[PDB]
């Protein structure tokens, strides 16, 4: 049972701008998704300080980066707080209408796309490199859900009967054909070292057979 929703018009406009602006510095998508994972891990850590049972769904707080050249996917997995169904539908827990407005104005005034995370809508930078994005998420207060979009103005949500996650968020980037450099170990390592060196959780880059 799959539900299809329209993006709010401002979010569709954000996505179109990310997809159709000429902008070479695409590697910042990974910094922005790792930043979102760090923020989600901080949230479950803070809740655990007063209620240790919040970690019954998994004590380890960390980030995995999983390239798969056969499937052409890069997956960013975290064991943070996760999202409810309502959060997914409401722009993946962001204030994206207001953040898009501000970002648009900042671009007009001379900012560039790499500054997206200052506007709270860094998730959508995934569309610099991905033709389709799938988000699998599990919050202590909800069931496991899958959100997916190939842009074009709509997204889907379904209950996920895939491999159970425990708690957290997994962002699966189905890469554009010309963006396969982001599956190469040396390239991923270089980007994590350049932009994510002060993230306070382990970031494990998986190896391929």
Q: What is the rounded (10 degree) CA torsion for 48, 52, 56, 61?
A: 40
Our finding on whether 98 is near Cl ion (CB under 5 A) is yes
> Over the range 79-101, which residues count as b (16 or more CB within 10 Å of their CB) and which as e?
bbbbbbbebbeebbbbebeebbe
Q: How many residues in the shown chain lie near Cl ion by CB under 5 A? A: 3
- Least Å from the CB of residue 96 to Cl ion: 6
* Span near Cl ion by CB under 5 A; candidates 26-34, 88-96, 126-134, 155-163: 88-96
Could you give the string, one character per residue 104-143, with x where binding to Cl ion holds by CB under 5 A and - elsewhere? ----------------------------------------
Quote the CA–CA distance of 29 and 32 in Å, as a whole number. 5
- Least Å from the CB of residue 119 to Cl ion: 11
- Least Å from the CB of residue 157 to Cl ion: 20
97 or 174, CB closer to Cl ion? 97
- Least Å from the CB of residue 34 to Cl ion: 24
Our finding on whether 21 is near Cl ion (CB under 5 A) is no
State the DSSP string of 150-198.
-STTEEEEEE--SS--SSEEEEEEEE-GGGGGGGSHHHHHHHHHHH-TT
Could you give the string, one character per residue 147-186, with x where binding to Cl ion holds by CB under 5 A and - elsewhere? ----------------------------------------
**Is residue 78 classed as helix, strand or coil in its secondary structure?**
strand
21 or 98, CB closer to Cl ion? 98
Lookup result for tokens 């997956």: 75
* Span near Cl ion by CB under 5 A; candidates 50-58, 78-86, 97-105, 189-197: 97-105
Residue 65's beta-bridge partner residues? 76, 205
Our finding on whether 95 is near Cl ion (CB under 5 A) is yes
* Span near Cl ion by CB under 5 A; candidates 10-18, 45-53, 63-71, 90-98: 90-98
Report angle CA 32, 33, 36 to the nearest 5 degrees: 90
Which residues have C-beta within 8 Å of that of residue 175, sequence separation ≥ 6? Answer: 72, 73, 74, 129, 130, 131, 182, 183
Q: Which residues bind Cl ion (CB under 5 A)?
A: 95, 97-98
């Amino acid at each position: 049972e799959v539900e299809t929703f329209a993006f709010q018009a401002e979010i569709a406009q954000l996505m179109s701008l990310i997809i159709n602006t000429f902008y070479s510095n695409k590697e910042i998508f990974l910094r922005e998704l790792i930043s979102n994972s760090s923020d989600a891990l901080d949230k479950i850590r803070y809740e655990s300080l007063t209620d240790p049972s919040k970690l019954d769904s998994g004590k380890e707080l960390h980030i995995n980066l999983i390239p798969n050249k056969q499937d052409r996917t890069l997956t960013i997995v975290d064991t943070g707080i996760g999202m409810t169904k309502a959060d997914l539908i409401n722009n993946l827990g962001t204030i994206a209408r207001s953040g898009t407005k501000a970002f648009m104005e900042a671009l007009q005034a001379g900012a560039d796309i790499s500054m997206i995370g200052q506007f709270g809508v860094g998730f959508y930078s995934a569309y610099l490199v991905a033709e389709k994005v799938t988000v699998i998420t599990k919050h202590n207060d909800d069931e496991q859900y899958a959100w997916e979009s190939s842009a074009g103005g709509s997204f889907t949500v379904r209950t996920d009967t895939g491999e159970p996650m425990g708690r957290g968020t997994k962002v699966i980037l189905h890469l554009k054909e010309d963006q396969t450099e982001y599956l190469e170990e040396r390239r991923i390592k270089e980007i994590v070292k350049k932009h994510s060196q002060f993230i306070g959780y382990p970031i494990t880059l998986f190896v391929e057979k």
